Structures are given as structure tokens and as C-alpha cells.
């Protein structure tokens, strides 16, 4: 009954949405945009099935790009410490097998068996990868199915399977050469390519550069953490679990607005005299839907307002407008 009162106070406190973001990653100072995205990932979009059987992805995939001195790994260790059904591994010192699934001999039966990789343990959950850019291309091309079709399909050793991989992926990435350079595109700052970058919903580019007031505040926070937030973890998780029971619907006024705001991203992404796309594929339209659904969950409303579309549109612009 007192937990029910906590949920009632949460929905009564109608600017809760800000308190949630500030409750994310409490050991990390600043980086409000990342914290917001992490909240929306943990809330997720809504999983859907079409009349033709085609599934449409619910999970939100995020990549956090920045210098190795940055707070990036502490974001991963926060989610790994906080989120149910979550796993942690490094891009180097892991293998495509240990990622999706392996095929091995059973010590009991002697014949072959499937052996579960991390993207199976993270099914209906989250997968957190450190040093993702330093992963072999052998293994980056392996997770392509799990990120989008949300399955691991296998045909090896006479054993055939299609195992579920409904995971939200969170990737800590370094730019090329380790140091970010905003004079280049996000295309140029990463060793990735469009097949994998289009599979990520949104990129947060947490570069580090000096600013004396921010630096004094950050230093004070770091030193105060060595002991010279709006919710407890239980309260935050209880709200997230409650919020995951909503299944928001696109209000009709949000639909046409979403079409136009996608068309603005679609226009501004275009490259060359051909007007070829690079970052805005159809996956990013679906990303706007998933993010607006996650926002509607963050607000505990079963309907998506056009404001939520605007927030998703702005969150996708973060990875583009730094031309």
C-alpha cells in the first residue's frame, strides 16, 4: 500500500519527467542528454506484430561516443548495476560466438548443442558493450540481426535455430584515434559504417572540453563523491516497471506532425548531387516512434502528444546538426 502511494505521488507530481532524468546515473555529473536517452532506452518502445507476421522493433539502441577519460564507462556500469536482465562485456576480449550464440558439444549427450551468448542472456533486457568501436568487424557484422530483427539465426554442425535476441544495445564508443574532432562529421569521427550506425537509434557525442565554471563544479562533485538525487534506486526502478505497463498510441495529431518532422530530418541528411541518405534511413522514422513511445511511458500517459514527437526529433538532431 505504501508502494502504491509512491506510484500515486509519482503520477501526481506531473513534472516527474525531469526528476527521472536527474535520477539516472547518479555517480555521473552533467550529461543530461545521455541520462535522458538512457531513461528512454530502459522504458523502451512498444513491441508490435503486423498482419503479415512482420515484427517491428520495440528496443532502443544507443551509442555513447567520447574520449576515454570521459564518464562513458560509468554510464555502462550504472545500467549494469541498476537494470534487471542486463549484461556487460568489452568489444575487445569478446567474440562473435560469445555475443550471439555458440555451437558446442554437450558434455552429457555428446552431440552438438546451442550455447547461449550474451545477446541471448540479454533477451527482453539490455546489452552493454564497452570499447565497442575496438571490436572486430567479424563481430560487429554478427550483431546486425539481433539489433534489428531481434533474433539470432544459426545454421551450423547440423543444428538449426532462430533464437530470440530482443535486447536494447548500449555501446560505449571512442572516436577514430581516441580524440573527438567536431570539425568532422559523426561519419568521420567513427570507424563505423551506415549498416551499423543506422541500426543505432540515436548517438550521444559526449566530447570533453574545458570550461572553468563547469570544470570547478565537476571537480567539486568528483571530490564530494570521494567524500571530502531525486529518487532512490528502488523508487526509480518501481516507476520504470510501472511505466513499462503502458502501451502508448499515436494520437492522430501526432501522426502527420511525425511525418513532416521525419521529412525534415530526411531532407537535412541528404548527401551529394544524388541526394543519397546516410544517417536518416527508414529505421530513424521508426526510431522517432520508439522514442515518443518511451517518452509517453516516461510521462505515464497511454497516448503520444506531438510534444513527444518534438522531443524525439530534437534527440535525433543531436547526432546530425554538428555538421
Amino acid at each position: 500500500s505504501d508502494e502504491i502511494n509512491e506510484l500515486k505521488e509519482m503520477v501526481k507530481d506531473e513534472h516527474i519527467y525531469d526528476k527521472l532524468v536527474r535520477s539516472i546515473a547518479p555517480a555521473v555529473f552533467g550529461h543530461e542528454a545521455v541520462k535522458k536517452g538512457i531513461l528512454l532506452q530502459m522504458l523502451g518502445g512498444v513491441h508490435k506484430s503486423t498482419v503479415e507476421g512482420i515484427k517491428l522493433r520495440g528496443d532502443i539502441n544507443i551509442c555513447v561516443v567520447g574520449d576515454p577519460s570521459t564518464s562513458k564507462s560509468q554510464f555502462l556500469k550504472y545500467v549494469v548495476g541498476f537494470a534487471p536482465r542486463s549484461v556487460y562485456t568489452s568489444g575487445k576480449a569478446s567474440s562473435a560466438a560469445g555475443l550471439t550464440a555458440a555451437v558446442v558439444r554437450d558434455e552429457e549427450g555428446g552431440d552438438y548443442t546451442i550455447e547461449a551468448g550474451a545477446l541471448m542472456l540479454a533477451d527482453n533486457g539490455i546489452c552493454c558493450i564497452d570499447e565497442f568501436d575496438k571490436m572486430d568487424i567479424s563481430d560487429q557484422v554478427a550483431i546486425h540481426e539481433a539489433m534489428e530483427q531481434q533474433t539470432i539465426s544459426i545454421a551450423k554442425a547440423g543444428i538449426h535455430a532462430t533464437l530470440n535476441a530482443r535486447t536494447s544495445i548500449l555501446a560505449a564508443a571512442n572516436p577514430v584515434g581516441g580524440r573527438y574532432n567536431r570539425k568532422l562529421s559523426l561519419r568521420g569521427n567513427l570507424n563505423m559504417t551506415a549498416p551499423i550506425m543506422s541500426r543505432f537509434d540515436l548517438f550521444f557525442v559526449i566530447l570533453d572540453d574545458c570550461n572553468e565554471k563547469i570544470d570547478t563544479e565537476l571537480a567539486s562533485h568528483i571530490v564530494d563523491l570521494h567524500m571530502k538525487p531525486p529518487f532512490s534506486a528502488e523508487q526509480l526502478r518501481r516507476y520504470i516497471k510501472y511505466a513499462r505497463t503502458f502501451k502508448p498510441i499515436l494520437t492522430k495529431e501526432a501522426r502527420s506532425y511525425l511525418v513532416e518532422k521525419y521529412k525534415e530530418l530526411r531532407k537535412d541528411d541528404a548527401q551529394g548531387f544524388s541526394r543519397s541518405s546516410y544517417r536518416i534511413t527508414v529505421r530513424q522514422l521508426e526510431s522517432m516512434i520508439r522514442l515518443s513511445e518511451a517518452i509517453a511511458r516516461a510521462n505515464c500517459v497511454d497516448e503520444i502528444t506531438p510534444s513527444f514527437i518534438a522531443e524525439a526529433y530534437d534527440l535525433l538532431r543531436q547526432s546530425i546538426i554538428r555538421v
Partner: protein, 69 residues
Amino acid sequence: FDILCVVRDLVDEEADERLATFVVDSHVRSHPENLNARQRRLQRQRKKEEEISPIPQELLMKYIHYART
């Protein structure tokens, strides 16, 4: 591979708007919450399938299998 399909993601405003409208309409038409109760929602489902499909998929699969065999 004795047919090749080449697929390109060109930015094109009147194609992208129809595509994006279709994708959004398809998403809500696939949303979970959207002659007894079980049969009634199947009839609504049938009309939803007829919103986009000139013949039912259930009919098409048997038609394929028949035509093949």
C-alpha cells in the same frame, strides 16, 4: 542469382512522405490494443488486412502451395 534487385535509399520528398505516412499508419494498425468476442476482433482484423492486401495472406499461402504442387 538469376534476378538481381538493386535497392537504393534516395532522398525524395513525395516518395518519402507517402512511405512515412504508410509506415506510421502501419505502426498504429499493428498496435496491440487496436460472432462472439473472439470472432468479432478477427473480423476487424480481416478488414485491417484488407486495408492493404488485395487477397488474404491465409488464402495466398494455400494458393502458393497449390500452384507449386
